């Protein structure tokens, strides 16, 4: 809970990957300093002009591997592309994002490791391989990128669509504040003895949005940059 104020803030892939992708001392998560972009996001029955910025990055659990002997072997495990399996089930309305949103990642010095279209679409499993020697027990984690969204005017129609959301009335309009997660082509194999307890999507949403963000004041552990609406370099 209050552990979220103890997580550091990182900017760009070098800082994020360097922090999380440590096999000796792996880290649960970190806040992400990123640019705000504006463009359409399809929620429910229509598109909405949405403000998107990266906010958090954490290690999602993949698998526990057991090698009982001093034998060199080749490991086959499977990772995912696009939105997380956790995010996909957390939404009940129709949800679609245009691949051009990846300007948020370019501008925030982040590269998923997947193509523009692969990165922001439906969850897809894929096989990855690693040469491993035992004896030992190992834990595999995959990097997840968390984004905070302000789907303008969506709140009246799609408040109940997301499991964790916040509405904010701006005149005759009702803004919708929610979180989304996409995965990266980044993984770490940690020996069980050094393994850290992974954060889950429910905990990340409760702490990042519900506990550390106030839509009314646009403040907390992070804030949106509404100037994206007037920047052509930050519109898709």
């Amino acid at each position: 809970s209050g552990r979220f104020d103890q997580y550091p803030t990182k900017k760009g892939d070098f800082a994020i990957d360097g922090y999380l992708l440590d096999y000796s001392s792996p880290k649960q998560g970190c806040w992400v300093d990123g640019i705000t972009v504006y463009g359409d996001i399809y929620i429910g029955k229509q598109n909405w002009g949405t403000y998107t910025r990266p906010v958090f990055a954490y290690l999602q659990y993949v698998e526990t591997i057991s090698i009982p002997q001093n034998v060199t072997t080749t490991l086959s495990y499977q990772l995912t592309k696009g939105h997380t399996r956790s995010f996909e089930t957390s939404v009940n309305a129709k949800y679609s994002v245009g691949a051009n949103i990846d300007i948020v990642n370019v501008g925030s010095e982040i590269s998923t490791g997947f193509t523009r279209s692969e990165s922001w679409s439906t969850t897809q499993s894929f096989t990855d391989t690693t040469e491993m020697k035992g004896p030992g027990t190992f834990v595999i984690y995959q990097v997840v990128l968390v984004y905070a969204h302000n789907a303008t005017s969506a709140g009246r129609q799609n408040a109940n669509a997301f499991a964790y959301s916040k509405t904010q009335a701006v005149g005759s309009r009702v803004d919708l504040y929610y979180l989304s997660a996409i995965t990266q082509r980044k993984r770490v194999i940690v020996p069980s003895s050094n393994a850290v307890t992974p954060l889950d999507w429910d905990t990340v949403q409760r702490n990042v949005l519900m506990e550390n963000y106030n839509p009314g004041s646009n403040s907390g552990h992070f804030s949106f940059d509404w100037s994206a609406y007037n920047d052509p370099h930050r519109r898709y």
Binding site: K45, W48, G49, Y51, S153, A154, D175, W226, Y229, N230
Partner: peptide
């Protein structure tokens, strides 16, 4: 406070 183009249909 945040600007918009979105019209609720």
């Amino acid at each position: 406070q945040p600007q918009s183009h979105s019209i609720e249909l």
